[PDB]
C-alpha cells in the first residue's frame, strides 16, 4: 500500500503497520545465530563471517556480555545494536543498585522492549532495526528470550535469528532434545546452522558461549570450535 507505508503511526485499512513490517526486513539481512538450553545450562552461537585480515578479531565478535551471568547477540542495523546493548548494560546495573542483585532476567528484557515499543507509537522517530537474543542464569535457572523491533517478548527452549532463521527452526523443531549434555547439544546446533547454510559456503570459526549453574560464562576459543 503505497498510501500507508510512509509513517509508523498509520494503520492500513486491513489493520497493519507496514513501517513495522519493513523494519523486520532489515533484520533478515544480518548474520545468523541461535540459542539452545540443555542440562543446567544454555548457550549461544553466531554465524561468524570471514572478513579482511586487517580487522582485529576481538571486536568482530557479536557475542556480547551484559553481566557475568547474562549475554546476548543481535542482528540488523549494527549502529542501533551497539546502542541497545549499552542500554541493556545500564538497565542491569539499575536493578543491582535497586535490589542488590540481578534477581531476574525478565525484569531486564522488559525494560528494553518498553524502550523499543516507545519508538513505534510516536511520530518523528523510526523504530529499531534489530532483534536480539538474551541468555543467562537467574534464581529460576537457565533462561532464553528474544525481542522483535516492536517489543514482542517470548521465552523459548531454543531459537534462531538472522537470515537462516526459518531454515534453522525447521531443522531444530525436529531434532531438538531437552536436558542434554553440553557438547552433545553444540554438535546439534552447528548442524542446524550447517543446514540453513548455502551449499557454496561452510562454517568459519563461529562464535560460541555457554554457561552452567553456579558458574559464569565461557567464551572458548576457535581451537575448541574446530572440534
Amino acid at each position: 500500500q503505497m498510501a500507508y507505508d510512509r509513517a509508523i503511526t498509520v494503520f492500513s485499512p486491513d489493520g497493519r503497520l507496514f513501517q513495522y513490517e519493513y523494519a523486520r526486513e532489515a533484520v533478515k539481512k544480518g548474520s545468523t545465530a541461535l540459542g539452545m538450553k540443555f542440562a543446567n545450562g544454555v548457550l549461544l552461537i553466531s554465524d561468524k563471517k570471514v572478513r579482511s585480515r586487517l580487522i582485529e578479531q576481538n571486536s568482530i565478535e557479536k557475542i556480547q556480555l551484559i553481566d557475568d551471568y547474562v549475554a546476548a547477540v543481535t542482528s540488523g542495523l549494527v549502529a542501533d545494536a551497539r546502542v541497545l546493548v549499552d542500554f541493556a548494560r545500564i538497565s542491569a546495573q539499575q536493578e543491582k543498585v535497586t535490589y542488590g542483585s540481578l534477581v531476574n532476567i525478565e525484569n531486564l528484557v522488559k525494560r528494553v522492549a518498553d524502550q523499543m515499543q516507545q519508538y513505534t507509537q510516536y511520530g518523528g522517530v523510526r523504530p529499531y532495526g534489530v532483534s536480539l537474543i538474551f541468555a543467562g542464569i537467574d534464581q529460576i535457572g537457565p533462561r532464553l528470550f528474544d525481542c522483535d523491533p516492536a517489543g514482542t517478548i517470548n521465552e523459548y527452549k531454543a531459537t534462531a535469528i538472522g537470515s537462516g532463521k526459518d531454515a534453522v527452526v525447521s531443522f531444530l523443531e525436529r531434532e531438538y532434545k531437552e536436558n542434554l549434555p553440553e557438547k552433545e547439544a553444540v554438535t546439534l546446533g552447528i548442524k542446524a546452522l550447517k543446514s540453513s547454510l548455502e551449499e557454496g559456503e561452510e562454517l568459519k570459526a563461529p562464535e560460541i558461549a555457554s554457561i552452567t549453574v553456579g558458574n559464569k560464562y565461557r567464551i572458548y576459543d576457535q581451537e575448541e570450535v574446530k572440534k
Partner: protein
C-alpha cells in the same frame, strides 16, 4: 569503627572489625565493612552505614560496566578520582563517610578518601575511631620488606589493640589479600583464630 589497609611489594592487605552501633548501643556484632568491588580491588567504609552501602552499589556497577565494555579493569588512581568527584559534587548535602581503596594494577596502591572528595595515596592508612591506636602500631612495626604472612599478623596485632581501647570497635576480624596471581582472597575465619592463638591475643 576501625579499618586498615597497607601495601607491600606485590600485594595489598585490608582488614576491619564487624561491630556496628545503632541507637547508641551494640545492635549488631557481625556487620560487614570490607567489600570486593573489582577483581583486583577492594574498599572499606566507616561512618553512616546507609550512605556507605549506597556507594558500594554505585561503584560495583560503574566498575563492572567498564570491565565489560572495555574488557579490562579500571586502574586504582581512576577509581579514587571517580569517587572524589562523586562526593565533592554534593559537599553541601554530603555523604558522611571515610573510605579506603586498595588494589593492584601494574603495582599496589592504597588511597584514603574523605567526605569532601580529598584523595591521597599512601603506603598504609586507617579510618574510624580506632585509627590512631593503629597508626601507633604501624609507625613502630611496619616495614616495606615484610612478607604477606608477616603483614597479616601485623594488621591483627593492630586491630586487636584498638578493640582493647576503642569502645565502638569489636567483633571478629575480616581480612583480605590481593595479588595479581591469586586475586582478591578473603581469608577463612579459622586461619584468623589460628594466628591469634599463635600470637597470644585471647
Amino acid at each position: 569503627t576501625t579499618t586498615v589497609g597497607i601495601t607491600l611489594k606485590d600485594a595489598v592487605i585490608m582488614a576491619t572489625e564487624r561491630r556496628v552501633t545503632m541507637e547508641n548501643f551494640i545492635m549488631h556484632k557481625n556487620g560487614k565493612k570490607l567489600f570486593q568491588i573489582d577483581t583486583y580491588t577492594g574498599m572499606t567504609i566507616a561512618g553512616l552505614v546507609g550512605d556507605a552501602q549506597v556507594l558500594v552499589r554505585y561503584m560495583k556497577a560503574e566498575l563492572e560496566l567498564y570491565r565489560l565494555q572495555r574488557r579490562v579493569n579500571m586502574p586504582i588512581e581512576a577509581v579514587a578520582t571517580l569517587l572524589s568527584n562523586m562526593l565533592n559534587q554534593v559537599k553541601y548535602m554530603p555523604y558522611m563517610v571515610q573510605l579506603l581503596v586498595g588494589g593492584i594494577d601494574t603495582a599496589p596502591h592504597v588511597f584514603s578518601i574523605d567526605a569532601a572528595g580529598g584523595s591521597v595515596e599512601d603506603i598504609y592508612a586507617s579510618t574510624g575511631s580506632g585509627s590512631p591506636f593503629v597508626y601507633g602500631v604501624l609507625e613502630s612495626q611496619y616495614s616495606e620488606k615484610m612478607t604477606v604472612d608477616e603483614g597479616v599478623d601485623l594488621v591483627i596485632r593492630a586491630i586487636s589493640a584498638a578493640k582493647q581501647r576503642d569502645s565502638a570497635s569489636g567483633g571478629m576480624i575480616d581480612v583480605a589479600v590481593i595479588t595479581r596471581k591469586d586475586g582478591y582472597v578473603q581469608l577463612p575465619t579459622d586461619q584468623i583464630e589460628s594466628r591469634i592463638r599463635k600470637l597470644g591475643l585471647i
